[PDB]
Design a protein around this ligand. Structure first.
Ligand code: HEM
Ligand code: HEM
Lengths: 176, 175
């Protein structure tokens, strides 16, 4: 089931609270090179999709087995399997580096278990999750995390603190 | 007409020998990837620059002008538009985000190439050949145009002239 890493800095924050603040920090991103983001290995598919903010040093990384349709029907659909979302700050590496990595990784969500097929187009969950983050709207990631936590134990939710989810077996603290 | 910039390092080199050496250095089925697409500035598929790093070494180049790339549209996988410059060297930095590509060490820059190729010509256009050739480290299409451009200025000048010699002529300038 879902597993979570967090920086001690965020020990007392609720996930809903952390994800709202992370997204306002990242902001909203005409599409061009500064703005498309990147796939590993790419160009339009890979095990990792990563995007830097145009506004701040915030950065994120979506991992699993992902496919972007670009202009093919249904256009501008991200689909595939999404296993991880890693949020933080200052993106590094890429296709010729062997993977994207965050220099300062604040929080990660792993074993999401999300899978959307091409046929749902842009209404697919994987699409609505990653596109949300690109756009400064983590609400779709929030909604999805909330369901994973609830199925583990009906007491846990995006309004649990990270530390409470550590007590629950789900989260695991790291330095800062 | 054509103008060259070169690092005093290559003052003694012929244009042909330097392009032979850069190509050897850049290097030579291979699945198309983030590691060999290069990129456009602003991009993603159009800009005032295209640039690529070799996967084998630090070698890299920047094609400058007003460039368009068809990708999957027709004619498929065609670079067209205007190509004014090719810069060759080491250590590609920058991007759309940094407001431009650059080379931390630019060795040679060929400018005022006056190359202009329409969409219709597809992959048979001179812009496409020059640049695709360079995407695999092959400077022969580039070399061919630079030679014809050197000569139009004066027949005594050519790809076999040293950069020093193209300076003395008035075509080249030391960086
Ligand atoms: C990573 C490589 C990507 C590239 C090169 C790319 C490129 C583009 C470009 C060039 C456009 C402009 C469309 C237009 O103005 O006609 C666009 C729009 C769009 N992209 Fe991407 N994108 C990438 C990744 C993603 C991802 C991962 C998602 C979703 C998670 C996405 C979703 C969209 C959506 C929804 C649009 C809106 C199209 C519209 O205006 O209706 N893109 N993309
Ligand atoms: C943003 C940069 C580029 C991207 C993302 C890109 C993407 C691709 C991809 C994915 C393919 C493979 C088609 C396939 O096998 O499924 C391809 C092929 C090709 N590209 Fe590019 N390309 C780029 C730049 C260029 C440039 C600048 C040129 C010309 C100077 C070019 C010329 C070609 C040619 C001739 C092929 C066909 C090779 C073959 O089918 O064997 N590409 N491109």
């Amino acid at each position: 089931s879902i597993s979570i890493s967090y920086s001690t800095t965020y020990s007392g924050w609720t996930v809903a609270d952390y994800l709202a603040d992370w997204s306002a920090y990242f902001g909203d991103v005409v599409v061009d090179g500064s703005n498309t983001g990147g796939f590993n290995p790419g160009p339009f598919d890979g095990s990792q999709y990563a995007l830097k903010s145009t506004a701040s040093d915030a950065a994120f990384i979506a991992g699993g087995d992902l496919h972007y349709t670009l202009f093919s029907n249904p256009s501008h659909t991200l689909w595939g399997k999404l296993d991880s979302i890693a949020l933080g700050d200052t993106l590094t590496g890429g296709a010729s580096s062997g993977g994207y990595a965050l220099d300062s990784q604040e929080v990660s969500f792993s074993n999401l278990g999300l899978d959307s097929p091409i046929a749902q187009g842009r209404d697919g969950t994987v699409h609505k999750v990653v596109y949300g983050l690109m756009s400064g709207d983590s609400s779709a990631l929030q909604g999805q995390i909330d369901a994973l936590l609830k199925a583990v134990d009906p007491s846990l939710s995006i309004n649990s603190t990270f530390d409470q989810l550590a007590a629950a077996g789900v989260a695991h603290a790291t330095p800062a």
